[PDB]
Amino acid sequence: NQYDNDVTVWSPQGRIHQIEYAMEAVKQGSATVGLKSKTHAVLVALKRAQSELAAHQKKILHVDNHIGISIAGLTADARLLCNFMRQECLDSRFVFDRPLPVSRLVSLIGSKTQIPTQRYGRRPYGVGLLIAGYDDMGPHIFQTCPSANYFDCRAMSIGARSQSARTYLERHMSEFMECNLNELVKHGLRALRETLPAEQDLTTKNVSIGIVGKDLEFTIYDDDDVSPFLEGLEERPQ
Amino acid sequence: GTGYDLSASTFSPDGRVFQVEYAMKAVENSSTAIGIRCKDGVVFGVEKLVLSKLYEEGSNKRLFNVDRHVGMAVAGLLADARSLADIAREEASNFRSNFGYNIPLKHLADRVAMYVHAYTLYSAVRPFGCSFMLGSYSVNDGAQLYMIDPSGVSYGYWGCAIGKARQAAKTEIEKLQMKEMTCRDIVKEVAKIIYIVHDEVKDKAFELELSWVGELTNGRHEIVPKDIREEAEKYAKESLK
Amino acid sequence: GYSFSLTTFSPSGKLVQIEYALAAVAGGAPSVGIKAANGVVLATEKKQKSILYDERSVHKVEPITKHIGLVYSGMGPDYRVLVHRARKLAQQYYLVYQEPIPTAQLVQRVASVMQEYTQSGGVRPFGVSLLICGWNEGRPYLFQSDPSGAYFAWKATAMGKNYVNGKTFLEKRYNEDLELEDAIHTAILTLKESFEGQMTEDNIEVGICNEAGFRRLTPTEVKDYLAAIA
Amino acid sequence: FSPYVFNGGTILAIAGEDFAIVASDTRLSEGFSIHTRDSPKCYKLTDKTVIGCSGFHGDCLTLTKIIEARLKMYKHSNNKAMTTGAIAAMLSTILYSRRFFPYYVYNIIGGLDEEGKGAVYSFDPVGSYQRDSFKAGGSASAMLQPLLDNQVGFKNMQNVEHVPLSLDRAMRLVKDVFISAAERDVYTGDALRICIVTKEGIREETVSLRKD
Amino acid sequence: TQNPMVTGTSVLGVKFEGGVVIAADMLGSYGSLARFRNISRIMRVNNSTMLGASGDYADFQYLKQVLGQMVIDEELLGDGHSYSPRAIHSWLTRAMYSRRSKMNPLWNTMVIGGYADGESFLGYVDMLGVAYEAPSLATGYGAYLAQPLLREVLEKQPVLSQTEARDLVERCMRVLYYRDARSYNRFQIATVTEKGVEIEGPLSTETNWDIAHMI
Amino acid sequence: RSEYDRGVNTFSPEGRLFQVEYAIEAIKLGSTAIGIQTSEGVCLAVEKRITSPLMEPSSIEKIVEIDAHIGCAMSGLIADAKTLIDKARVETQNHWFTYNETMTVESVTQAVSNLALQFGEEDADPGAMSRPFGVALLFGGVDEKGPQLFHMDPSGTFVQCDARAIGSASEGAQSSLQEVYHKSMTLKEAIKSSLIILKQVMEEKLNATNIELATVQPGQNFHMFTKEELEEVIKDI
Amino acid sequence: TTTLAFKFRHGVIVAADSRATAGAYIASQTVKKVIEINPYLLGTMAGGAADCSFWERLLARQCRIYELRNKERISVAAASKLLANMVYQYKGMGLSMGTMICGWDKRGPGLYYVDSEGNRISGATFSVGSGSVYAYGVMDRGYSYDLEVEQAYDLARRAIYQATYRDAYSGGAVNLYHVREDGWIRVSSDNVADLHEKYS
Amino acid sequence: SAGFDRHITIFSPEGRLYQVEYAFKAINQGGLTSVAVRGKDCAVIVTQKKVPDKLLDSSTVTHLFKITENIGCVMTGMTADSRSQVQRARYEAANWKYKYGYEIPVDMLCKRIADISQ
Amino acid sequence: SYDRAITVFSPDGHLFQVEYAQEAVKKGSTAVGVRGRDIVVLGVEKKSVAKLQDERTVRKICALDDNVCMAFAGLTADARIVINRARVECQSHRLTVEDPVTVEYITRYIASLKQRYTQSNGR
Amino acid sequence: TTIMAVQFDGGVVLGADSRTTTGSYIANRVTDKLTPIHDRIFCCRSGSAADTQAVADAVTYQLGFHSIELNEPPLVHTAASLFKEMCYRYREDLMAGIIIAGWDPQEGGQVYSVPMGGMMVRQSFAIGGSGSSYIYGYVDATYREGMTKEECLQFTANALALAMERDGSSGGVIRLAAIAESGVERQVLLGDQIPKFAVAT
């Protein structure tokens, strides 16, 4: 095509194709589910290993005591954006002596991701991020995209085969506000389990958990730490 | 022809810029936002399409606070709209830091017009995909309201409509005895017009974003409170039966 | 900005855009320059496409210094830019040396600027050719500058539209012992060889340079010469 | 114009077999006047390390904010906590990075090393450092030094066994030398902030001093 | 600024149960000359923070538009976040340390008052970036005159009401007007509490001169 | 439109850069390298691929010493990985200066991985890069968490591997590592199995001249195996 | 602070004290004035302790960088020249530093003297410090190239003892090192008062 | 046509810049006609004031522009280039008054604007 | 400034520009270097010199430092640039280190410069 | 140098002397120190002549630019903000005291003072310059609120003439301007027209 080379070139229907290729790169990545209770925010990320002799790829990135990030898509672009927002939190703690509010932070994330979509010859950062945060008004699950659009969600799922998890979160949406932390993590585990094929189930090796909220720093549970949370999960009904 | 429709820095053989028209079309497939200036303020109403039920209330906001007396109404890509809102906020801050008083809305509209169209001269940058409306109140200038498109042209308006249903809402605005009638029924008629122009068949159920500026807040732009919003919603729904 | 030169070699080894600017010059207005024994005369067509034009508001023959003048064939605004550049270079020479600038040195520097305009990235060569007249060292000087950036010293030359006929006419009618008045007559006659329509004192522009310096002919003198020749 | 103001203050740190103790006065003053009676100069770095910083209070605050920014940057970079010798390296490099415009601070670092043993690091305003069993810094530094030199370091002593340092003797020594510091140093008084770093963590207490 | 030209004199502030009260006069002194007598040195930041300062007034005017700009930046987002008094303390400390750092400091010393989350707040930022919190604070000659009385009151009664603190700062300004040659008998008093920040204009204290008959 | 007319940051329809896929393809043209991580240490074994009898084998370097407790194994273009190994050594000395301590092997791995995708043609600083490295690296070292082996690819993806094989015969040697590795595997068994797999994947006869072997052990520095020791290691194979 | 070094038939002898003061107040008596640059190279410290320590640490970083990039141990002369290069840039802005670089390289035992003033002198014998003249007087009587290991140790120890007895800024403990063809060794760290009792 | 002469300002085989003619064909896209006549003691500009929508503000849709007190101007073309050129002309007039100390002549100002066009 | 990358990845991963440079090398004259025990011998194939051309201006053997010399195959002017860069690097190393360069060091420098010329735009 | 202004119901009255000196020598005796900024905005300059002239020219140029851009008459407050910003931003190199008085339809007549250091304040009457300090008590004793135009001129002439007599840096003639709805009216008092005051000892 003639209009899928550069982000500054406009289609007759009014669409920019290269940004859509960036979201297709986001869809290429594995699935993660961000879901919040009245007091907690949990990211359940499905880790992937390139081989049996290779470890699982890290997907949950802790940033601050109130903020953690799960990724989907390109890992290096996620690292760059994540370090930029890390030093943003560092600047907020340095100058203001307060944790940075999550909403203005993700507004700045959209502000930065606005610029590669308007300049010639430059690509958007091909990664979509689910954001678990806490501030004075409560916990937050946010999502940001390479199209510089950020959305606040009670629950969200992104990555490969995330539609089943989105259906599961939509079917139980009134319960997450009243579910406790264990029930929230179990619901997120079942949602990420809905993304999985019928021949593979949740293991300790491929699940990362990131929790933030009251009386709780953003803690990442990996491997054996996932094992208590896998306990109590019901089997798949036929 | 080939090559005339790739850059904003090239003309058509007729003398047109195809990228600006594609920005117009990227405006024209967005949701309907209207804004009416009356005798004592400027009231904006935005149709917010709820594409997913997972989004929280307060997501995808198209009403912005440019300044403590200046309110904002956009339709198009939300990223370009937010960037231009930040540009207008920085220009208002610069005006306050250089001059020490409230910025006239004609001045700020000119500045954002200059910053929108300055990217339509080059192949290295693309035109914005969002049309928008600036509305302000002051005691000396009264209420004022301006329309700026991605071509960077600012026009004064008494009331205007942009988005997918700009023509129907414009004709609905044309039917109002308007220069004498108060904001408190401006908002109700905005709700009625927005609910009329929304097509329930081809679009999902939406939210009625609403805001004003004027004498009732001493020239301060604010979002419409809950009871007034649901009152305008009930008036609009009772006008549809 | 663009750092890529708009003027590059063809596979034949030629500079195509220089030929294009030369073609633009050939579509320009005639400019006749004759170096007499006591000065140089420059004459040009000043035909306006309507009578609504203010003829005396915009000119085509301008003095760089008191004793240096210039006329062009080709593009108006490029000629204006070169007049700006030449005046600034001549005043640079005046600031350094507090002496009147020799004509050939101004020709060299203007040609150098228009040369680097044929090499620099993102810029185009000027669509002009120049006839530069002057008086220095008790001698009159006449030069031409081409779109290639080359410059040729001339005793008599003709440019613009129908420049071949003007050059042949000057070859058939130039003498070294020509006076200033006879050079003016020959320049106006050379303009008559390529002009269409009846000539006025308003549709041409003539200036001369001598030991008193360079200055433009007033319309009274132009119409007096036109009544004398015809 | 002068960018530096001596705010007074006396700090001390001692290293034990499995513990460290960092103490500081709480008086912050200028000239012949007290800004505040409650300015403890022991600030929390890690679970196993406490900083102690005296001198220009703005320089103290700048040192604390810079060192905590570097703390969090290392936690994000290498996904693990400090080592105390690396903290000493950070502080020395930070002090020497502005050799032409130094921080007007005397600093001690008190905590546990990688083997759980007490670790005390003494610093100057311009980046020299050394690991010591004990160090007194600040205005009343050199007065409290020889008490640690003869009681703990056993100097000018004859014919008694160098007994191991227990916790009660250490805290009694610190309380007595800071009482002596309040009695003579005019910038020392009001209260005394003492923290003890052991493998279980760091514990805190405060002793009232004289108020004049 | 290397030389403050017209300066502001002592500013007092003290805590009480439910808020903080800060008082200062409107005397801008042209060195020795009492030049300006109605220029406010007590300015409200937002609903929960307010400032007073001593020293050069052009520098603190610059501080006024920069604080107003960053505050208006806060409410123009509309997120619901507001600037806490401690965050304003931190930002002021960073700004003054930066200005001292590049050898062009702001010649002002600030007493900052706040009341948020059911807690009162009083902070002190000098001209060189040294910042600290205390229940009672004073500047300049007030830092040698009023705060002994403030500390004496606090040592026998740490918790005060609004009227007790008001009477105490009235007596302290009577002493200050008695003894400071850069003082004036015309001051403003402001109070930050949960209902917000309130500024009071025309306030003078009674003067006793009976001792002049005791010659 | 030919495939040369797209930029280095142009994405594929699947969502990947074309140049990093080309570098991944260029990995498969390099020499065969096997790293095995054990509890006794990490062993590295790389084929030299001597192409001429006039080519000096000691001039063929594949295993490099990052620092005294970290070495590296190679697949890919020599000229790029020389700069990458120099960057790793400068970073180790930077941390040794500023921190007065060595970093982890993982810290080396991200510090060398973060420059992999720093390439571009537009608004590039003087010193930037026009094409990503076609280099895959195996970092074997000993740190406070024990012996460690990591894999780094041109995409910037770095992973922990118990036994990783890179190069032209990387898949078959990886299956060989799968069928020979266990968690209770010794360093001598790792060396013997790694040289056995190199012998079965290389097109030549395995001798002491066309292979390189190195071991990193706890309590020991980085060790380069000499040709004689290589011969007696060969002797039982 | 008094440090000395001399080359002889079995290598290089380096000797130092350990007293550091802050003005007139003795800050410490256990400061190591000899840095161990590498197993074949040592450097002394005299004057500004921060300056000496940081520039010798940077020298250690640079020589380790050279060993990594060229697979060769650095000579004494090249290390001293790079030291003079990076201290020559900051000349005149308040640097106070004086060091001796001792080691063994391909040419054998190498000793150089570098300062913060751009001096870089090769010589068989050197001593740096305020009490350096007190060391000088003893060692000019004691020095010989045909000296063995033990009497060279005793000469260096006695010269440092005399310097610590005669200089106020010298004291603490005497640290001795011996650079040989296989590298340096740490000889002893002997207390000054015990040396006075021994020599009485 | 040779190369990208139809797309940017480079010469044709005839030596003509097609983007200049495209600028001429973009002038008339506004659909307006402005007539400016010099009298014996006056100068008069008459232009079209097209108001197709009554919601448009007639006070804001205008083409008669004021540079300074003495100089006025009428405009042809599209509105963003209209405001940009009048703003640059106002800035150049202000710079002329700030440098040379007097009000800029009309011929000098239009010479500067056409040089900017060059 | 000109910032067009000349050498980029082909879809098969080869670098065409380096291969064309290798073809230009193979078009050049033959240079043979043999390392002896206490001597190194270089020998270049002299082209058929024109009868009016000076043979001293066409020498393909030049020294880079007082212990290190070189021979080249390829373009003469590019080799002159290489030789000049090597000479200034040898003098800079002698200034910085107070030692003459080693063969491996200057070889590493000139080949790193050549690889740097493979890894920039407009070069 | 003595400059002052008084606000009245309807506008402002500016008054100044005309002595400009360097050292003890009178460089000029007839310097017009009522510098016009806009058609109904005037400023009074004291201190360094070049600095005051430069800041007045820059503010006039910028104010004309902004008033043309906004197509509105300039506010006296806006002009005073421009003076305050320029005097505060360059406060370490200029010696200037400016008394800016003007009229706008939005706020009537306004007086603003920008002293050394760059402060800004609005007042009913502003005093500045070298002679200023010698008439404070008089201008604290004669001014009355709600004061008329012609008596503002009388007060201005009297206070000016007293500063003329007291200050050796004040001299020359008396220059007056009055800004109101009708515009600016300018007057010069000289010789016997200067109000005399009895000094008999």
Swiss-Prot record, chain B:
GO terms for cellular component: cytoplasm; cytosol; extracellular exosome; nucleoplasm; nucleus; proteasome complex; proteasome core complex; proteasome core complex, alpha-subunit complex. Induction: Down-regulated by antioxidants BO-653 and probucol. Up-regulated by bacterial lipopolysaccharides (LPS) and TNF. The modification N6-acetyllysine is found at residues 53, 202, 226. It is found in: Cytoplasm; Nucleus. Gene3D superfamilies: Glutamine Phosphoribosylpyrophosphate, subunit 1, domain 1 (3.60.20.10). One of its GO terms (biological process) is proteasome-mediated ubiquitin-dependent protein catabolic process. Component of the 20S core proteasome complex involved in the proteolytic degradation of most intracellular proteins. This complex plays numerous essential roles within the cell by associating with different regulatory particles. Associated with two 19S regulatory particles, forms the 26S proteasome and thus participates in the ATP-dependent degradation of ubiquitinated proteins. PANTHER family: PROTEASOME SUBUNIT ALPHA/BETA (PTHR11599). This is Proteasome subunit alpha type-3.
UniProtKB/Swiss-Prot annotation, chain C:
It comes from the Eukaryota. One of its GO terms (cellular component) is nucleus. SMART domains: Proteasome_A_N. The modification Phosphoserine is found at residues 3, 10, 12. The modification Phosphotyrosine is found at residues 2, 20, 72, 117. It holds the Pfam family Proteasome_A_N. InterPro entries: Ntn_hydrolases_N, Proteasome_alpha, Proteasome_alpha-type, Proteasome_asu_N, Proteasome_sua/b. The modification N6-acetyllysine is found at residues 66, 167. PROSITE patterns: PROTEASOME_ALPHA_1, PROTEASOME_ALPHA_2. The keyword Nucleus applies. Phosphorylated on tyrosine residues; which may be important for nuclear import. Keywords: Acetylation, Cytoplasm, Nucleus, Phosphoprotein, Proteasome. Induction: Down-regulated by antioxidants BO-653 and probucol. Down-regulated in response to enterovirus 71 (EV71) infection (at protein level). GO terms for biological process: proteasome-mediated ubiquitin-dependent protein catabolic process; response to virus. CDD domains: proteasome_alpha_type_2. It is found in: Cytoplasm; Nucleus. PANTHER family: PROTEASOME SUBUNIT ALPHA/BETA. Belongs to the peptidase T1A family. Component of the 20S core proteasome complex involved in the proteolytic degradation of most intracellular proteins. This complex plays numerous essential roles within the cell by associating with different regulatory particles. Associated with two 19S regulatory particles, forms the 26S proteasome and thus participates in the ATP-dependent degradation of ubiquitinated proteins. NCBIfam families: PRK03996.1 (NF003075). This is Proteasome subunit alpha type-2.
From Swiss-Prot, chain D:
Signal peptide: none annotated. The lineage of its organism: Eukaryota, Metazoa, Chordata, Craniata, Vertebrata. The modification N6-acetyllysine is found at residue 175. InterPro entries: Ntn_hydrolases_N, Proteasome_bsu_CS, Proteasome_sua/b, Proteasome_suB-type. Non-catalytic component of the 20S core proteasome complex involved in the proteolytic degradation of most intracellular proteins. This complex plays numerous essential roles within the cell by associating with different regulatory particles. Associated with two 19S regulatory particles, forms the 26S proteasome and thus participates in the ATP-dependent degradation of ubiquitinated proteins. GO terms for cellular component: cytoplasm; cytosol; extracellular exosome; extracellular region; ficolin-1-rich granule lumen; nucleoplasm; nucleus; proteasome complex. One of its GO terms (biological process) is proteolysis involved in protein catabolic process. It comes from the Eukaryota. It comes from Homo sapiens (Human). Pfam families: Proteasome (PF00227). It is linked to Neurodevelopmental disorder with microcephaly, hypotonia, and absent language: An autosomal recessive disorder characterized by microcephaly, intellectual disability with absent speech, severe developmental delay, short stature, and hypotonia. Affected individuals also manifest aggressive behavior and have hearing loss. Keywords: Acetylation, Cytoplasm, Deafness, Glycoprotein, Host-virus interaction, Intellectual disability, Nucleus, Phosphoprotein, Proteasome. The modification Phosphotyrosine is found at residue 121. This is Proteasome subunit beta type-1. The keyword Mitochondrion does not apply.
Swiss-Prot record, chain I:
Phosphorylation by ABL1 or ABL2 leads to an inhibition of proteasomal activity and cell cycle transition blocks. Coiled coil: none annotated. Induction: Down-regulated by the ribozyme Rz3'X. Up-regulated in colorectal cancer tissues. It is found in: Cytoplasm; Nucleus. It comes from the Eukaryota. Belongs to the peptidase T1A family. The 26S proteasome consists of a 20S proteasome core and two 19S regulatory subunits. The 20S proteasome core is a barrel-shaped complex made of 28 subunits that are arranged in four stacked rings. The two outer rings are each formed by seven alpha subunits, and the two inner rings are formed by seven beta subunits. The proteolytic activity is exerted by three beta-subunits PSMB5, PSMB6 and PSMB7. PSMA7 interacts directly with the PSMG1-PSMG2 heterodimer which promotes 20S proteasome assembly. Interacts with HIF1A. Interacts with RAB7A. Interacts with PRKN. Interacts with ABL1 and ABL2. Component of the 20S core proteasome complex involved in the proteolytic degradation of most intracellular proteins. This complex plays numerous essential roles within the cell by associating with different regulatory particles. Associated with two 19S regulatory particles, forms the 26S proteasome and thus participates in the ATP-dependent degradation of ubiquitinated proteins. The chain holds residues 2 to 124 of 248 of the full protein.
